Write a protein that binds this DNA or RNA. Structure first.
Ligand SMILES: [Mg+2]
Ligand SMILES: [Mg+2]
Ligand SMILES: [Mg+2]
Ligand SMILES: [Mg+2]
Length: 212
DNA sequence: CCCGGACCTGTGACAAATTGCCCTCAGACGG
DNA sequence: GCCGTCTGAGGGCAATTTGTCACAGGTCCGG
């Protein structure tokens, strides 16, 4: 009975770089906006702690540092670039934060759409594994299975992977294998994949999955 | 031919970053 | 009105994970 996140495919497939803590906050903003026109959201420390099973102290640390790391962050929809925030965050009351999302982002948030319950993702740690799990949901069938081929260059561009993952053996070891292992251990999805080649170069990854 | 060279793979090392933990002390509130 | 408790805003930590690069070791091309 946990919150059902839905988002436009354009966000699933946008180019940006966010941490886990920021992505966690981002799911609730999308939830708040959708339940309504101006872009102003709010986060309560004690509620965040209860959702993600943290203490109040570590929640406060997570929100505060996440919040100041949004500055200068930009989002690209393929292209068009936007800042996420147009005013610094601020706290009117103790245990409470108020934030100002770029109102021009509203239409990008909200029948080409992606949807998942928040409990599916709340134990994932690596933000790239959150990105991969969202793109797979975009292709999921009602029953819970799907199959899709993602191109390696597009993965690198959209998820803004760091430069050393342009060497394929590092791509495998520190991104692909790790995020496939997390999904299989931390979500209800059971995931497999295979590599597509052209000559000596590996060009796509083909993902298949079913539901537990 | 065999060479040096341009590709590809995986692993061992080390540097940089993130994780859940731990401790202090004042704010807000109610009994 | 004061004070005890529930909060959360600060300061830190060591153990793991993520990001980078050298080197070993495969193939095929062409002079
Ligand atoms: Mg933290
Ligand atoms: Mg080649
Ligand atoms: Mg040997
Ligand atoms: Mg050699």
């Amino acid at each position: 009975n946990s919150p059902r996140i839905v988002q436009s495919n354009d966000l699933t497939e946008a180019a940006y770089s966010l941490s886990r803590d920021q992505k966690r906050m981002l799911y609730l903003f999308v939830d708040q906006i959708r339940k309504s026109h101006d872009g102003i959201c709010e986060i309560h420390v004690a509620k965040y702690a209860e959702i993600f099973g943290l203490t109040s102290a570590e929640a406060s640390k997570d929100i505060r540092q996440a919040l100041k790391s949004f500055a200068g962050k930009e989002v690209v929809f393929y292209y068009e670039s936007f800042p996420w925030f147009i005013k610094p965050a601020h706290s009117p009351s103790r245990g409470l934060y108020s934030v100002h999302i770029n109102p021009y982002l509203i239409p990008f948030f909200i029948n080409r759409f992606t949807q998942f319950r928040l409990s599916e993702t709340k134990e994932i740690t690596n933000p790239y594994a959150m990105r991969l799990y969202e793109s797979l949901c975009q292709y999921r069938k009602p029953d819970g299975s799907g199959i899709v081929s993602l191109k390696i260059d597009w993965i690198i561009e959209r998820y803004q992977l760091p430069q050393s993952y342009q060497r394929m053996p590092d791509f495998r070891r520190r991104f692909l294998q790790v995020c496939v292992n997390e999904i299989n251990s931390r979500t209800p999805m059971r995931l497999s994949y295979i590599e597509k080649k052209k000559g000596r170069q590996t060009t796509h990854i083909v993902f298949s999955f079913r539901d537990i």
